[PDB]
Amino acid sequence: SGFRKMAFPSGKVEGCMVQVTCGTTTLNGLWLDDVVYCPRHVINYEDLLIRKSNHNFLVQAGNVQLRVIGHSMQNCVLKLKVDTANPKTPKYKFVRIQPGQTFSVLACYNGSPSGVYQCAMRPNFTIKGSFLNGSCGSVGFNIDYDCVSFCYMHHMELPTGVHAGTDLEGNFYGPFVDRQTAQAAGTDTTITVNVLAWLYAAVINGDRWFLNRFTTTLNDFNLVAMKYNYEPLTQDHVDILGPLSAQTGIAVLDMCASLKELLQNGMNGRTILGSALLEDEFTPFDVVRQCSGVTF
Amino acid sequence: SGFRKMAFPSGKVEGCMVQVTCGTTTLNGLWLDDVVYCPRHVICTSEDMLNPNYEDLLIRKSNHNFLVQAGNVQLRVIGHSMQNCVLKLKVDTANPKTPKYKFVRIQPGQTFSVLACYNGSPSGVYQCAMRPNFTIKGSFLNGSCGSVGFNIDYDCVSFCYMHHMELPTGVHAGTDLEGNFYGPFVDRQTAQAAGTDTTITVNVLAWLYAAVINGDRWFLNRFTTTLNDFNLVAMKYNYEPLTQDHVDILGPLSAQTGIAVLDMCASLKELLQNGMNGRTILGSALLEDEFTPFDVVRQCSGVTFQ
Numbered sequence: 001s002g003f004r005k006m007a008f009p010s011g012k013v014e015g016c017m018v019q020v021t022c023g024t025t026t027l028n029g030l031w032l033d034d035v036v037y038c039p040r041h042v043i044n045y046e047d048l049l050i051r052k053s054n055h056n057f058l059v060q061a062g063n064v065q066l067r068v069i070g071h072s073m074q075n076c077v078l079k080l081k082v083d084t085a086n087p088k089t090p091k092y093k094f095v096r097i098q099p100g101q102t103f104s105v106l107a108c109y110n111g112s113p114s115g116v117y118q119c120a121m122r123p124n125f126t127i128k129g130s131f132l133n134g135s136c137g138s139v140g141f142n143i144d145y146d147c148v149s150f151c152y153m154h155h156m157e158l159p160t161g162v163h164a165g166t167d168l169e170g171n172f173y174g175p176f177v178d179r180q181t182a183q184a185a186g187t188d189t190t191i192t193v194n195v196l197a198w199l200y201a202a203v204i205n206g207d208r209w210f211l212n213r214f215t216t217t218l219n220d221f222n223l224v225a226m227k228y229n230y231e232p233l234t235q236d237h238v239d240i241l242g243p244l245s246a247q248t249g250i251a252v253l254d255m256c257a258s259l260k261e262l263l264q265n266g267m268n269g270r271t272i273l274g275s276a277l278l279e280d281e282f283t284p285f286d287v288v289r290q291c292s293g294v295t296f
Numbered sequence: 297s298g299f300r301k302m303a304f305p306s307g308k309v310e311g312c313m314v315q316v317t318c319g320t321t322t323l324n325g326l327w328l329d330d331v332v333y334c335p336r337h338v339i340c341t342s343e344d345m346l347n348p349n350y351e352d353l354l355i356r357k358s359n360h361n362f363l364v365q366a367g368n369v370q371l372r373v374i375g376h377s378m379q380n381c382v383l384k385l386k387v388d389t390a391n392p393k394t395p396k397y398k399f400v401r402i403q404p405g406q407t408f409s410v411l412a413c414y415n416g417s418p419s420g421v422y423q424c425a426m427r428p429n430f431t432i433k434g435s436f437l438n439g440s441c442g443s444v445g446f447n448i449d450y451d452c453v454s455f456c457y458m459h460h461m462e463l464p465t466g467v468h469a470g471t472d473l474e475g476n477f478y479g480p481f482v483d484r485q486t487a488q489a490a491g492t493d494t495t496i497t498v499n500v501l502a503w504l505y506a507a508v509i510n511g512d513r514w515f516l517n518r519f520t521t522t523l524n525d526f527n528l529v530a531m532k533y534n535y536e537p538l539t540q541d542h543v544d545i546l547g548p549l550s551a552q553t554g555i556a557v558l559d560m561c562a563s564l565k566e567l568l569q570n571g572m573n574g575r576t577i578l579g580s581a582l583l584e585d586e587f588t589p590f591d592v593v594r595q596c597s598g599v600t601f602q
C-alpha cells in the first residue's frame with residue numbers, strides 16, 4: 001500500500017554525468033560512449049562555435065579530465081567528441097516524449113548529481129522542475145527493462161519559475177528558444193488521462209469516497225472538462241485506461257462522472273491519496289507499474 | 297526556482313541491493329563490504345509469524361540455508377549473526393561497489409530517500425519522512441522487505457531505515473541498520489497499530505520559509521505569537537509541539553527571509569484557522585510537512601525572491 005511520486009533509480013544516469021566548462025560558463029554534460037552532450041548555450045551559435053577549439057572545452061568526469069577531440073552541433077545540443085568511451089555507458093536510446101508523459105530528472109551541479117525527482121511534460125511543454133543556476137544540462141529519462149530512454153535536457157528557466165529544455169537531439173519541447181529574450185509559458189492545462197489514472201490508483205489504495213453510480217458520454221465529459229482547463233480526453237486515453245478499468249470495476253466514463261463531480265463540487269474538505277488537489281503527474285503506466293512492483 | 301519533493305540519487309545504494317532467500321521467503325538485503333544486512337523475519341515460516349523465537353529459529357540454520365544473489369551471481373554465506381531485528385550474513389566477497397557509508401538512527405520529522413526493491417532489484421526512489429508516530433507513509437508491496445532509507449550528504453551514504461512491515465492502516469514500520477525498530481513495533485504478526493499521527497510543525501515552518509524564498513508571501517500577517525500560545529493553538533490541529541530547538545534550527549531561514557520564527561508561527565496559526573481559500577503554496581493545497589529545515593536550505597537558493 002501507499003502511493004508516492006516515484007522516480008526511476010538514477011544509478012545508470014549518474015555514471016554518465018560530467019562537468020562541461022567553456023569560458024566562464026560551467027554546466028552539466030551527458031557522457032555516452034565517446035560523446036558528451038550538453039546545451040549549446042555553453043558556447044549565432046555556428047559563428048560562436050567556429051571560434052572555439054577543442055581545448056576551450058574543459059570536460060571533467062569525477063576527478064578526471066577528458067580530452068575533447070571534436071565538436072559539432074545538432075539543433076540546441078552541443079556534441080563534444082572525447083578520446084575515452086564512458087565505460088559506465090548503459091544501454092540507451094534518445095526518445096522524444098509527448099505532453100502528459102512523465103520522466104525522472106537527475107538534477108546536477110558541476111557534473112555532480114544532487115537529486116532525483118519525477119515530473120511530467122506539461123501540455124504547455126514546460127516542466128515544473130526544481131532547478132538552480134548550474135543545473136543546465138541535467139537530464140530527464142525513463143527506464144524500460146535495462147534500457148535508459150533519455151528524453152530531456154535542461155536548458156533554461158522561464159519567468160514564472162517553470163523550466164524549458166530539449167530532447168537529446170536538441171529540439172526544444174515547446175515554442176522556446178535558447179537565448180536571453182522575452183519568452184513566456186503559455187496557459188497550462190490539466191492532464192486529464194493522468195488525473196483519471198491517479199483516481200484509479202486511489203481506488204486501488206482503498207480511497208473510494210468520490211465514486212458514484214453515474215456515467216457520462218465522452219462528448220459531455222469533454223464539454224465539462226474544457227470549462228476547467230482540462231485537456232480533452234480521447235478514445236486513445238479511454239483505451240489506455242482499460243486495464244485499470246478492468247481491475248477496479250469502474251468504467252473509464254464512470255470515473256469521468258466522478259471527475260466531473262469533483263470539478264463541479266470540489267473535495268469538500270476531503271483528500272485523495274493525501275492530496276487536496278487532483279494530481280496529474282502519474283500516467284496510467286506509472287500507476288500500473290507502482291501498483292505491481294516492476295524492477296530495473 | 298521550483299520546489300519538488302526530491303530524493304537523493306540512488307546509484308550508491310543500487311550497487312548494494314541483493315536478494316536474500318531462506319526457504320520459501322525471498323526479500324532484499326543490503327550488501328556492504330563482506331556483510332549482507334536484512335530483516336531477521338526472512339527465517340520465519342509465516343505460521344511462526346505470531347510468536348517467533350528468532351534465537352531458536354536461527355540456531356537451526358546453517359550458512360548454506362541462506363541463498364544470497366547479487367545480480368546474476370550467487371554469493372557464498374560464510375557466517376551469520378543476529379543484531380536486534382537484523383540478520384547479518386557474512387559473505388565470501390566484499391562488495392566492490394560499497395560506497396563510503398554510516399549507519400545513523402534518525403528522529404521523527406527527519407526525511408530520507410527510499411530505494412524500493414523487489415527480488416534484490418531496484419524499482420523506484422521516493423522521498424519520505426519518519427512520522428512523529430514512528431511510521432513512514434511509504435509505497436511498498438509484498439517482497440519490498442529489506443528495502444532501505446538513506447541520505448547522501450557529501451558522497452557518504454547514511455543508511456537510516458530498513459523496511460520490515462506494513463501496519464493495518466497501510467503505513468510502514470522498520471528498523472535502523474542496527475536492527476532497532478523505530479516506534480513501539482515488533483517483528484511479529486500480533487495485532488499492532490500506528491498511534492495517532494501528528495503534523496511535523498518545524499517542517500511545515502521550513503516549507504513556509506521555502507515558499508517565501510521562492511517569491512510567495514500571501515499567507516504572512518502583521519502578527520507574532522509567543523511560543524506557548526503557538527503550541528496551545530497547534531496542538532488543537534494535531535500539530536507536534538514546536539520546541540526552542542526547532543526555533544533555533546529555523547534561525548538561518550529566519551535570517552535569510554527577514555521573517556522572525558515566531559512571526560512565521562503567527563502565519564501558520566492563521567493558515568490553520570482560515571485554510572488556503574482556493575490558493576496554493578508551492579503548488580500544494582495542504583500544508584506540507586515532509587521537508588526539513590536542512591532540506592529547504594539544500595534545495596532552495598541562498599537569495600530570496602523579494
Ligand SMILES: CCS(=O)(=O)N1CCN(c2cc(Cl)cc(CC(=O)Nc3cncc4ccccc34)c2)CC1
Pocket residue numbers: 001337436437438439440441460461462463464468482483484485486487488489
Ligand atoms: C493482524 C495484526 S497486524 O495487521 O497489525 N500485522 C502486524 C504486522 N504483520 C507483519 C509483521 C512482519 Cl515483521 C512482517 C509482515 C510482512 C509484511 O508486512 N510485508 C510487507 C511489507 N511492506 C508492504 C507490504 C504490502 C503488502 C503485503 C505485505 C507487505 C507482516 C502483519 C500483521
